[PDB]
Amino acid sequence: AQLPSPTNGKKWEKVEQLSDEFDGNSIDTNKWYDYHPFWEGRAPSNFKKGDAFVSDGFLNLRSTLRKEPSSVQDPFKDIWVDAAAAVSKTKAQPGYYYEARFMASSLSMTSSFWFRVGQFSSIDVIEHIGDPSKENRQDDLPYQYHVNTHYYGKHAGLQPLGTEYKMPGRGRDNFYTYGFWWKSPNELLFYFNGKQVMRIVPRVPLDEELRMIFDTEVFPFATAGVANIGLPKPENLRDNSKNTMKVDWVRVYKLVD
């Protein structure tokens, strides 16, 4: 995919420790955790180590059935979904350009690309609901590229600030390239297949380093930027043709000279 024009005659140079074509036999443990070392996941899902795995040219983030949801006390709370997460060992920094090309899962769970593990901020480039089980959301969520920022810690109290773009085709049917220029602490620019589509001026400067993350989550009710999407279906979690978010690659660049 094409990168923004570089500011002032600078050139883009790849940040190797945050970029990966995922074309090997297994995940590069110098660069990635294949689980989330800082968070267990969003009940009734928790991340299972290795449900994020490299194979067939992709970082694959698969969500599988841990327990029958009719077997646990409350399927909105008790853990019965094994979700996937990969988290960067190197920190993401203000100023860089980030882009991931991926096809969402076909589950009522997120396929997400975002930044956190900070002290006061998060940046969600996309939290895509490939196939919401609440069926009145099928004409909308599968086309949505929804970006968001969150504020906590010293800035708890501030509401999220986000926006969205309606894609021409469903996230679960396409590899699309979602791009994000952390251009300033006060200016985030978002790209869809190389075209600038969204802009957020964050409520306070996003000037702290964050880790970069791909994951999948169940949302048991509307919360932290996310609608009422429905719980996923065991028959889809069991199906490897539907249960996997596939990231063909992630590339990150900084301006040099």
Ligand X SMILES: O=S(=O)(O)OC[C@@H]1O[C@H](O[C@H]2[C@@H](O)[C@@H](CO)O[C@@H](O[C@H]3[C@@H](O)[C@H](O)[C@H](O[C@@H]4[C@@H](O)[C@@H](O)O[C@H](CO)[C@@H]4O)O[C@H]3COS(=O)(=O)O)[C@@H]2O)[C@@H](O)[C@H](O)[C@@H]1O
Q: How many CB atoms lie within 10 A of CB 124?
A: 23
User: What secondary structure does DSSP assign to 63-100, as a single string?
Assistant: -EESS-GGGSS-TTTS--EEE-EEEEEEEE-TT-EEEE
Q: Which does 248 bind (CB under 5 to 8 A by kind): Ca ion, ligand X, Mg ion, none?
A: Ca ion
Q: Which residues of 232-246 are buried (b: 16+ CB within 10 A; e: fewer)?
A: bbbebbeeeebbbbb
Comparing CB distances to ligand X, the nearer of 7 and 96 is: 96
Phi/psi of residue 141, nearest 5 degrees? -55, -40
Q: Which does 107 bind (CB under 5 to 8 A by kind): ligand X, Ca ion, Cl ion, none?
A: Cl ion
For residue 90, the minimal CB distance to Mg ion (Å) is: 18
For residue 110, the minimal CB distance to ligand X (Å) is: 5
Q: How many CB atoms lie within 10 A of CB 133?
A: 16
Helix/strand/coil percent split, the chain, to 5: 10, 45, 45
Q: Please give the single-letter amino acid code of residue 189.
A: L
For residue 192, the minimal CB distance to Cl ion (Å) is: 25
Which positions touch ligand X (CB under 6 A)?
38-39, 42, 110, 112, 114, 116-117, 122, 124, 127, 150, 213, 217, 224-225
Structure tokens at 164: 């969205």
For residue 180, the minimal CB distance to Cl ion (Å) is: 25
Query: Under the criterion CB under 5 A, does residue 175 sit at the interface with Ca ion?
Result: no
Binding map of Mg ion across residues 52-91, x = CB under 5 A, - = no contact? -x--------------------------------------
For residue 59, the minimal CB distance to Ca ion (Å) is: 8
> At 135, is the secondary structure helix, strand, or coil?
helix
For residue 60, the minimal CB distance to Mg ion (Å) is: 8
Query: Under the criterion CB under 5 A, does residue 21 sit at the interface with Ca ion?
Result: yes
Which positions touch Cl ion (CB under 5 A)?
26-27, 53-54, 107-108, 232-233, 236
Q: Which does 115 bind (CB under 5 to 8 A by kind): ligand X, Cl ion, Ca ion, none?
A: none
Comparing CB distances to Mg ion, the nearer of 34 and 127 is: 34
**Can you say whether the dihedral through the CA atoms of 3, 90, 148, 219 is positive or negative?**
positive
Query: Under the criterion CB under 5 A, does residue 140 sit at the interface with Ca ion?
Result: no
Distance in angstroms (rounded) separating the CA atoms of residues 254 and 97? 6
Residue 223, class by beta-carbon neighbours within 10 Å (0-12 exposed, 13-18 middle, 19+ buried)?
exposed
Q: Give the residue, chosen from 102, 145, 176, 249, that forms a contact with Ca ion under the rule CB under 5 A.
A: 249
Comparing CB distances to ligand X, the nearer of 222 and 224 is: 224
**Interaction site with Ca ion (CB under 5 A):** 21-23, 57, 248-249
**Interaction site with Mg ion (CB under 5 A):** 27, 34, 50, 53
